[PDB]
Amino acid sequence: ASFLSSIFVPVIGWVVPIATFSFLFLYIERE
Amino acid sequence: SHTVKIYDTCIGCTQCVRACPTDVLEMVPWDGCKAAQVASSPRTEDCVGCKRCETACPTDFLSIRVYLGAETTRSMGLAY
Amino acid sequence: LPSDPRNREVVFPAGRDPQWGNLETPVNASPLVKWFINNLPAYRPGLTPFRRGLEVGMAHGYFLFGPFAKLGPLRDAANANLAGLLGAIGLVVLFTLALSLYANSNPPTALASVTVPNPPDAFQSKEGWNNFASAFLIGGIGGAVVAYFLTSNLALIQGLV
Amino acid sequence: TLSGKTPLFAGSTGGLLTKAVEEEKYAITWTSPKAQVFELPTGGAATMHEGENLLYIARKEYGIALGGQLRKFKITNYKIYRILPSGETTFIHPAD
Amino acid sequence: RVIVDKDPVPTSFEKWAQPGHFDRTLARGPKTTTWIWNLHALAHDFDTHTSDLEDISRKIFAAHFGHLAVVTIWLSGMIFHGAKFSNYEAWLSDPLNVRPSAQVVWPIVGQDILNGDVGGGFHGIQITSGLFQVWRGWGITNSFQLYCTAIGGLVLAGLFLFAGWFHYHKRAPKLEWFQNVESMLNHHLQVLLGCGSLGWAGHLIHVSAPINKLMDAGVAVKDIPLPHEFILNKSLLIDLFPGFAAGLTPFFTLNWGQYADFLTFKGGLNPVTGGLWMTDIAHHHLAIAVVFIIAGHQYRTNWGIGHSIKEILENHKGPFTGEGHKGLYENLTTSWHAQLATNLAFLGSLTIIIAHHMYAMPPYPYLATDYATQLCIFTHHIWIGGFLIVGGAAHAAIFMVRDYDPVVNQNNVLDRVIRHRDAIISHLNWVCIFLGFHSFGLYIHNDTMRALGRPQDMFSDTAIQLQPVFAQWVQNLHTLAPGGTAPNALEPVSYAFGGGVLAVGGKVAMMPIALGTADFLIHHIHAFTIHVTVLILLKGVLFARSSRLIPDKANLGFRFPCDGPGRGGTCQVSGWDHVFLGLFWMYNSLSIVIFHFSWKMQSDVWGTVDAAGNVSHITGGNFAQSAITINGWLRDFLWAQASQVINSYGSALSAYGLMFLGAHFVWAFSLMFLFSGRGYWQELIESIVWAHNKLKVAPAIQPRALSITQGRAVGVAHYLLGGIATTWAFFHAHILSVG
Amino acid sequence: DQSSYLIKFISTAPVAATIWLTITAGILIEFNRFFPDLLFHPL
Amino acid sequence: PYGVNNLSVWAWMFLFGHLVWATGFMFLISWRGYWQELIETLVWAHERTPIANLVRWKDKPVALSIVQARVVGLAHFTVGYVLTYAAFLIASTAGKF
Amino acid sequence: LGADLTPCAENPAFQALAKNARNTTADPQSGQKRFERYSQALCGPEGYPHLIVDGRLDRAGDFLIPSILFLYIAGWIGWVGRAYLQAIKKDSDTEQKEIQLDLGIALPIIATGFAWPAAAVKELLSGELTAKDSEITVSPR
Ligand code: CLA
Ligand code: CLA
Ligand code: CLA
Ligand code: CLA
Numbered sequence A: 001a002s003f004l005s006s007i008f009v010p011v012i013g014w015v016v017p018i019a020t021f022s023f024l025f026l027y028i029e030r031e
Numbered sequence B: 001s002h003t004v005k006i007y008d009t010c011i012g013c014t015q016c017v018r019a020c021p022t023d024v025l026e027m028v029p030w031d032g033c034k035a036a037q038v039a040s041s042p043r044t045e046d047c048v049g050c051k052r053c054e055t056a057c058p059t060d061f062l063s064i065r066v067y068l069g070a071e072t073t074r075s076m077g078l079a080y
Numbered sequence C: 001l002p003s004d005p006r007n008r009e010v011v012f013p014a015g016r017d018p019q020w021g022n023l024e025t026p027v028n029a030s031p032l033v034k035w036f037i038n039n040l041p042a043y044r045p046g047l048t049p050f051r052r053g054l055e056v057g058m059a060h061g062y063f064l065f066g067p068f069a070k071l072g073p074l075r076d077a078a079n080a081n082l083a084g085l086l087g088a089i090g091l092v093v094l095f096t097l098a099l100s101l102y103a104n105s106n107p108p109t110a111l112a113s114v115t116v117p118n119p120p121d122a123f124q125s126k127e128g129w130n131n132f133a134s135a136f137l138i139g140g141i142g143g144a145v146v147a148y149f150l151t152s153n154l155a156l157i158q159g160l161v
Numbered sequence D: 001t002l003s004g005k006t007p008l009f010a011g012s013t014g015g016l017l018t019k020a021v022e023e024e025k026y027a028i029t030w031t032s033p034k035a036q037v038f039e040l041p042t043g044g045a046a047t048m049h050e051g052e053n054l055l056y057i058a059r060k061e062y063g064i065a066l067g068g069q070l071r072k073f074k075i076t077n078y079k080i081y082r083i084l085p086s087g088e089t090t091f092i093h094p095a096d
Numbered sequence E: 001r002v003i004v005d006k007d008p009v010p011t012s013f014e015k016w017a018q019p020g021h022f023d024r025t026l027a028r029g030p031k032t033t034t035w036i037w038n039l040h041a042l043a044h045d046f047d048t049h050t051s052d053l054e055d056i057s058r059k060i061f062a063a064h065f066g067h068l069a070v071v072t073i074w075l076s077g078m079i080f081h082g083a084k085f086s087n088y089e090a091w092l093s094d095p096l097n098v099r100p101s102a103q104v105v106w107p108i109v110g111q112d113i114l115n116g117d118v119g120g121g122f123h124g125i126q127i128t129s130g131l132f133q134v135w136r137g138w139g140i141t142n143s144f145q146l147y148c149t150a151i152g153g154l155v156l157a158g159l160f161l162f163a164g165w166f167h168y169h170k171r172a173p174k175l176e177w178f179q180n181v182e183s184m185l186n187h188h189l190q191v192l193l194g195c196g197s198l199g200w201a202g203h204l205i206h207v208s209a210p211i212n213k214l215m216d217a218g219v220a221v222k223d224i225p226l227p228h229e230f231i232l233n234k235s236l237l238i239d240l241f242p243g244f245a246a247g248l249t250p251f252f253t254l255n256w257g258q259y260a261d262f263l264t265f266k267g268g269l270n271p272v273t274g275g276l277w278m279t280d281i282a283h284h285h286l287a288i289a290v291v292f293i294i295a296g297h298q299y300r301t302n303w304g305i306g307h308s309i310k311e312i313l314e315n316h317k318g319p320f321t322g323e324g325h326k327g328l329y330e331n332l333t334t335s336w337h338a339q340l341a342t343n344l345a346f347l348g349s350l351t352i353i354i355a356h357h358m359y360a361m362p363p364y365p366y367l368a369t370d371y372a373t374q375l376c377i378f379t380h381h382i383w384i385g386g387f388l389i390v391g392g393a394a395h396a397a398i399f400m401v402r403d404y405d406p407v408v409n410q411n412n413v414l415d416r417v418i419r420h421r422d423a424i425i426s427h428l429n430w431v432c433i434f435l436g437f438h439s440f441g442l443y444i445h446n447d448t449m450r451a452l453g454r455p456q457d458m459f460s461d462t463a464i465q466l467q468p469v470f471a472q473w474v475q476n477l478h479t480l481a482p483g484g485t486a487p488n489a490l491e492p493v494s495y496a497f498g499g500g501v502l503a504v505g506g507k508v509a510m511m512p513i514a515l516g517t518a519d520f521l522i523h524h525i526h527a528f529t530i531h532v533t534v535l536i537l538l539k540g541v542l543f544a545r546s547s548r549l550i551p552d553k554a555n556l557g558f559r560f561p562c563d564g565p566g567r568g569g570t571c572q573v574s575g576w577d578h579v580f581l582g583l584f585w586m587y588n589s590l591s592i593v594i595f596h597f598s599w600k601m602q603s604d605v606w607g608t609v610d611a612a613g614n615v616s617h618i619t620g621g622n623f624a625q626s627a628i629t630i631n632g633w634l635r636d637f638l639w640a641q642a643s644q645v646i647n648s649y650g651s652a653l654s655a656y657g658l659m660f661l662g663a664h665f666v667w668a669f670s671l672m673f674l675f676s677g678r679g680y681w682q683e684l685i686e687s688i689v690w691a692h693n694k695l696k697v698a699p700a701i702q703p704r705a706l707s708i709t710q711g712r713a714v715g716v717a718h719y720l721l722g723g724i725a726t727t728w729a730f731f732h733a734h735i736l737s738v739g
Numbered sequence F: 001d002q003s004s005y006l007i008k009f010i011s012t013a014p015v016a017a018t019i020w021l022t023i024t025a026g027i028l029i030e031f032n033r034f035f036p037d038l039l040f041h042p043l
Numbered sequence G: 001p002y003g004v005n006n007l008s009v010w011a012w013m014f015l016f017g018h019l020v021w022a023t024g025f026m027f028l029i030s031w032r033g034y035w036q037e038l039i040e041t042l043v044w045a046h047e048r049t050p051i052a053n054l055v056r057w058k059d060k061p062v063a064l065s066i067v068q069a070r071v072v073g074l075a076h077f078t079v080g081y082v083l084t085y086a087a088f089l090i091a092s093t094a095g096k097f
Numbered sequence H: 001l002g003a004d005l006t007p008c009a010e011n012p013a014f015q016a017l018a019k020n021a022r023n024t025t026a027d028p029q030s031g032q033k034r035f036e037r038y039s040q041a042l043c044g045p046e047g048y049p050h051l052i053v054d055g056r057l058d059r060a061g062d063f064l065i066p067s068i069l070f071l072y073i074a075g076w077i078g079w080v081g082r083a084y085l086q087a088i089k090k091d092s093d094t095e096q097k098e099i100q101l102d103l104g105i106a107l108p109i110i111a112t113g114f115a116w117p118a119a120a121v122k123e124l125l126s127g128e129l130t131a132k133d134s135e136i137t138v139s140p141r
């Protein structure tokens, strides 16, 4: 099942930092 | 802001008041020393942490001391 | 090439207050430049904030088909232009995030320069910046399709003209 | 109010910034014996008037750095205010 | 208008006894070891003492005789060492094989192995300074002409040293003698430059070019007559140079075409020596000389006629710049740093132009033949030119602090760059960033594409062209200029643009340099590292007096460490510290210029010509596909060319093996001063003074750590010394082996 | 006395340390021309 | 320019380590007060640019503090010291066996 | 022996380095006289003399002889410099005499101190060598 690399690596490469940075930027800039 | 502690060892030299560029320091009368005045810091929200006031004090060790604290806009020296 | 003519000057200061940190130069207030910048869709009078981002999205989504399709990795293959379409659409979405990420962070008020005497009043509210963000994704995707439609058959439009 | 003349210079890029609209803004007034050339702490040279002057500065640090430059002109009358964006003018220099 | 004071300063050994007599604070005696370093620092800073500009200027003019003595002692030393300890008379017989050598080493500790065999039965250090090309270019034939020159230099070194005593301690000028800058420019442009090049034009025509023409025939060295017999026996200036029997009258009847044998316009390289034609240099320095004597009659003196510089500058003003150049006369006639900033940024920029105009147009007999000489003349004057531009930036920041005046400099072009200094820097900040990505990131792009096995995605001559259109065009104009836009020439100004391959023996003198994709990247690396260096130096000039951070920076001084830990931290705000940071980028910028040179010339110019005209280069022609990746700069330049410097033990290149490692040391040693701070090292001495207090070896002069400014200055002086000496020992041992 | 200023100049810090380190270095150099290669004492 | 092999990561990481190492000198030779006077010109030329001053920071840009870029300077120094030798230790041994 | 140490006079590697001697000084046989003295050392497998810092009296010329010769000199450098700083402390200037040497005081200090092992014990046994710890400045703890 070597096709899981095609679906975990782009999520951790792209989706994981986009979801993390967009959470943290809205959390540090929160009155 | 920062914290300006003035101990009881100074002589009223008025070198620290004539060196703080945001004019935090001022002389108040005080019957202790020979010149009969001690430095006082009533406006420490304006202090920028320059430590020009520690450089100009004669006494060993320094009667004035600047403790660097939380840095607001006036103490960062930001024109913006 | 004497202007007024041996005299006088152009760097009179901004708004006749020299103690403000700005000046009026031939790049600031030359009335062809001031007319141009005031009439970009970010600054034009009489526009909905959805209407402002609709032209801005169609313009920025248009040329971003360019560098992906002709410099990307697939630029020798049969999918040379489709690789530039997915890259351009795929990067407007990264800009649609950054507009919505900027808008939701309680954004500061927009500036008022010397070539533009007012911010356009739709750029001080979270709801105002969100309409600009929703328009940018619609116009950005559509502006990249019409760049994909024209360049994919360059021999046909030139024969049909 | 303040009611001072503005010195002669062609404008600077230093000047005042967005803080002068938003957080605070200072202003130094001095009554000059004559008209002569001094320096701006924003940058460059200027020309004071005769009588009461006025210079809107960015920070308090500028007006006391300027007041030392005015001391070698026999001008020891400079008074810095703190002009808040709500219109609240606060006399801060000197203490009395 | 010469007025001269009579005996201002008595000549005595009084002030040699007490040290540090010059400053009132520093003369009271030492208390710490800070006094020891301030004596050597404030020594030649004559401006800090008084306000009397008359008194300072006399010290400045007399010390300038001191530096003229030590250059003449140096220069007559190089002729004297080349008279006794050289193979100059064996070099003249065969410059194609005998290596230029002086400096015979004393044989004491086994350092006699440095006296290697250079050819001609002579053992010594193969020099690279190129003095044998100069002396042949002067026309020196035997040793006795080198003795009387060197002995003549030692007399001329004594007149400079005597006049420095005389014009200070005995007869010193007044102030107004110095401020006659109209009278100075008339004497210095005419008599020094114009009459100096007119007299030297007389030396090629009557002396040098007759000898260098007899050398090119291959006659002999001894059989060529003495050069004063060329003036006496006029029959030998008519066997060669036949346009000489007409004599002096074609000069005065304007029949200047009669002189067409020895004031030519050949325009190219001599096929025998690989140098310039000696007749072209004769018509050069003569035509140079006429222009200077005319243009030195420009400025007004005691006789009414002439331009006035206070009236030239104040007319040139426009609508944009207000009062224009009104007020810049008083800056340049009162301040000495304003002169020193101007005469040093434009003489340092001149020295780099000299380096470019001497590798392509080699002006000496057998200069391009010796690859070991031509590489080192370029890389020498590159660095000498680069330090002076930083110095002009340094002494301009000193002008802004001490000598700037608001009253004079009101609304002129000096004032108008301090109003918009935020617009100058931030638009310069953008270009330094823009050139950083679009020039260096195209190497990082090519590093990654070759590592990922994608060679078709690279910016190379094969995959993605970046051809330098605007410099491939200018080469095609300078190739086609003979017959066209300059019809009187024959070949171009040099063969670096076009033309053909000129071989001298086997080695290439000069070949057409072809610019390509790798040459596009490295010329835009050069623009990047120069605009960043300007960014640091100009920021120290514009923000010398104040900024938004420090409104009273000129109150503190030119050279102060910081303004305390406040405002976030204000360390390295001074105008001194921007000179400190620019010395690294000057080191960074000039190291790539001399790396571009040392590998473009080996890969695409230098080499050996075969019989059929095939040019076999040194490195086989690999600059094209390897100077586009940082791996290629590491593999094929630093790694591959160091195989002659580290394998050089047990041979004559052993000292370059020791200076290669020894300069890696001093470079690494400098980081102890740069990284660490002063306040650590003062605490450590307190624990060493204790062990010195315990055994009663307490020094009366208290030890202190080096100051904050000095710890930066020691850390950049040891940095620049070990970084350049690495390259000094790397260029020599590579090119004294493959040349 | 002009001659006393020359004794007082020859005994400053860099001038005495130049002469003394020249005499020191010259002893090591002229000992090594005549008796070279002394790695260890021969016993 | 002839090709690649299995050592091309370690050849790339070796150059990568020389670059992280050299980057950390910038935080150590140059100190803070040069950089706060540089950022104050970028704060100026962002409030004056006519289209790009629609957006504006929430946090005012200041330069890195004195203790901070001794951390950040030592971080680029130490990471580059490790990665340079670890690319040389492996590939000089795994290329020779 | 020693160890991994054959004598140099028995090694074929040392005698191979003997045939290609390089002259140290302009003495034409300085390459040859170098190796007749290195024949008594212990050359390993390479042909180079390996020294013995042990204390063995047959290998005393390596380190035992130069250690005595060094420590007499370098202690005398520091003994003279100690006795001069004691002298100029009791004078009027005390900092002129540090950079600008009192040569009339310095030269009697230099010529005297060659018997410093006879001297430096006498300050030790009388306790004048050191100072009291209640008389030296110390840092706050
Ligand atoms: C670790 C995560 C990761 C992954 C999985 C990839 C994957 C890829 N990169 Mg890459 N990249 C990364 C990190 C990563 N990168 C980083 C950190 C950098 C900075 C140094 C780069 C810089 C970089 C450049 C400069 C380029 C790539 C390119 C590519 C593509 C090469 C294959 C190809 O021919 O494209 C074929 C496929 C296409 C041309 C289009 C595919 C569709 C796109 C990806 C998205 C479509 C819409 C999407 C579904 C929704 C919006 C996007 C979403 C992320 C929000 C591939 C998709 C090349 C490329 O094509 O980029 C577009 C290219 O030019 N990368
Ligand atoms: C002097 C300027 C000028 C030019 C360059 C043209 C050019 C043309 N005309 Mg023409 N025309 C003109 C003036 C001009 N006309 C005037 C003054 C009149 C009034 C009497 C006419 C009346 C006229 C008629 C009635 C017709 C033309 C047609 C044509 C086209 C014939 C070629 C063909 O087969 O089309 C092949 C090309 C196409 C069918 C489509 C080409 C793409 C179009 C032009 C625009 C695409 C979108 C564009 C880029 C953006 C929006 C438009 C933009 C102008 C705002 C050609 C494009 C014929 C035609 O095809 O018209 C459409 C036609 O039927 N013309
Ligand atoms: C025409 C040449 C020239 C002249 C006349 C001056 C003159 C002056 N400069 Mg200036 N300068 C120059 C070029 C020049 N400079 C250049 C090219 C630079 C760039 C590097 C500078 C950078 C500079 C700075 C940054 C400063 C000056 C200062 C000064 C003033 C005092 C200098 C002093 O007393 O030094 C005394 C002499 C020394 C301290 C000795 C320094 C020794 C150097 C660092 C080492 C040399 C390395 C050597 C080649 C290798 C030796 C190897 C070793 C093993 C022996 C004086 C007016 C200072 C000042 O305050 O002005 C008012 C000041 O702050 N200058
Ligand atoms: C190798 C070391 C190194 C590097 C990279 C830099 C980099 C820089 N220095 Mg610098 N500096 C250094 C050493 C270095 N310095 C040292 C040793 C000193 C001590 C004297 C200084 C002193 C110094 C001063 C005094 C100044 C600079 C300035 C600059 C900037 C120039 C603008 C530029 O080219 O940026 C462009 C960036 C690069 C060339 C780096 C390559 C980046 C690539 C192309 C892109 C990144 C790849 C990828 C997309 C990353 C994303 C991956 C993702 C997963 C996160 C830049 C930040 C100047 C400045 O800031 O003004 C402009 C300035 O004034 N530096």
Ligand SMILES: CC1=C(/C=C/C(C)=C/C=C/C(C)=C/C=C/C=C(C)/C=C/C=C(C)/C=C/C2=C(C)CCCC2(C)C)C(C)(C)CCC1
Residues within 6 Å of the ligand: C058, C059, C060, C062, C063, C138, C139, C141, C142, C143, C145, C146
């Ligand atoms: C100022 C100027 C300039 C610049 C300019 C430019 C360059 C511009 C750009 C341009 C561009 C940038 C363009 C754009 C345009 C746009 C367009 C053309 C678009 C289109 C679109 C469309 C058509 C779409 C549609 C749609 C939608 C919206 C949605 C749905 C879908 C569809 C598809 C339907 C120049 C240089 C000339 C010079 C000087 C002046």
Ligand SMILES: CC1=C(C/C=C(\C)CCC[C@H](C)CCC[C@H](C)CCCC(C)C)C(=O)c2ccccc2C1=O
Residues within 6 Å of the ligand: E672, E673, E674, E676, E677, E678, E679, E681, E682, E704, E705, E706, E707, E708, E711, E712, F017
């Ligand atoms: C080493 C070092 C010191 C200490 C270094 C000092 C005090 C210099 C001492 C070196 C010289 C060589 C000592 C010379 C002492 C005598 C004058 C020489 C005695 C020998 C004579 C014969 C010459 C600092 O104070 C410092 C401060 C800030 C940043 C970095 C550093 C730093 O790296």
Ligand SMILES: CC1=C(C/C=C(\C)CCC[C@H](C)CCC[C@H](C)CCCC(C)C)C(=O)c2ccccc2C1=O
Residues within 6 Å of the ligand: G026, G027, G028, G030, G031, G032, G033, G035, G036, G062, G063, G064, G065, G066, G069
């Ligand atoms: C470059 C530099 C700056 C300016 C640099 C700044 C203000 C930051 C530059 C980096 C920007 C913010 C981008 C950061 C991106 C990093 C490569 C990765 C960030 C991700 C981590 C934070 C997780 C200073 O202010 C400074 C102060 C004192 C000593 C040295 C220096 C110094 O060297």
Ligand code: SF4
Residues within 6 Å of the ligand: B006, B009, B010, B011, B012, B013, B014, B015, B016, B017, B037, B038, B039, B056, B057, B058, B059, B063, B064
């Ligand atoms: S704190 Fe210092 S400056 Fe202030 S009164 Fe005391 S001694 Fe004087």
Ligand code: SF4
Residues within 6 Å of the ligand: B002, B004, B019, B020, B021, B022, B023, B024, B025, B046, B047, B048, B049, B050, B051, B052, B053, B054, B066
């Ligand atoms: S922080 Fe220090 S330097 Fe600044 S005003 Fe206060 S006492 Fe003066």
Ligand code: SF4
Residues within 6 Å of the ligand: E561, E562, E563, E564, E565, E569, E570, E571, E572, E677, E708, G031, G066
């Ligand atoms: S140089 Fe040192 S003392 Fe001065 S501000 Fe910087 S860190 Fe503080």
